[PDB]
Write a protein that binds this ligand. Structure first.
Ligand code: NAG
Ligand code: NAG
Lengths: 33, 33
């Protein structure tokens, strides 16, 4: 799950069926490296 | 106004009716931090 394929919206307390995970921004390896 | 919803083309000098404001790149806070 990458933020050039997903987008940020809303909060996790309303939608039903949402699950715990981590979403890997492709900007993160660029900024960490 | 996000660069994930707008794109990079042109300048202030061609298109009629442009108003002066700021554009919040969603990359900009990670660039700053
Ligand atoms: C319907 O979805 C909820 C939330 O995802 C889940 O807890 C529930 O078990 C589901 N219903 C069935 C019959 O599995
Ligand atoms: C994981 O999802 C649950 C909902 O099942 C939520 O309450 C929790 O805040 C989430 N995050 C965690 C455990 O870091």
């Amino acid at each position: 799950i990458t933020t050039d394929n997903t987008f940020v919206s809303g909060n996790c307390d309303v939608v039903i069926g949402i699950v715990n995970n981590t979403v890997y921004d492709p900007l993160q390896p660029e900024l960490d490296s």
